[PDB]
Amino acid sequence: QNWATFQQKHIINTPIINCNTIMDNNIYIVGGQCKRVNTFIISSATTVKAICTGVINMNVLSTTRFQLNTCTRTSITPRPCPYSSRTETNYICVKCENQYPVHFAGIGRCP
């Protein structure tokens, strides 16, 4: 929804493949239940922010390729919920507002 929250939800400095431990956080409880999917971007925050340099309001596909780990919920259970992991290197689409990434829009292409 904003840069600060986007960072907390998506950006990590080092690779953490265990989706089960990293997804066990209050920030991932949408609508009472555990969030269905969340993609982590292994990168410094500065480079992710740079996707939006000079962009006031629009979805932008990065020109930088990132190492990613997407965590997908396999079932709805009491916390912590079980998650599967999918790692890949790809470009990402983020909503840029006032030169800041504020929402993760997709992998590989913008909607």
User: What is the stated resolution of the deposited model, in angstroms?
Assistant: 1.9
**Residue type at 75 in one-letter notation:** S
Technique used = X-ray
Is 103 part of the annotated catalytic residue set? yes
Q: Which residue has the tokens 């209050």?
A: 26
Q: What domain range is 50 assigned to? A: 2-111
Annotated binding site for substrate: 35-39
Beta bridge partners of 70: 39, 86
Report how many domains make up the chain: 1
Distance CA 31, CA 65 (A): 32
Q: Please say whether the beta carbons of 104 and 94 come within 8 A.
A: yes
Cβ neighbors of 25 (< 8 A, separation 6 or more) are: none
From the list 3, 50, 72, 103, the catalytic residue is 103
Virtual torsion, Cα 8, 11, 13, 17, nearest 10 deg: 100
From the list 6, 9, 10, 28, the catalytic residue is 10
Closest CA to 61 of 21, 22, 106, 20: 106
CATH number at 89 reads: 3.10.130.10
Closest CA to 5 of 65, 61, 56, 45: 45
DSSP single-letter state for residue 87: E
Is 34 part of the annotated catalytic residue set? no
- 38: number of CA atoms within 13 Å, CB side? 27
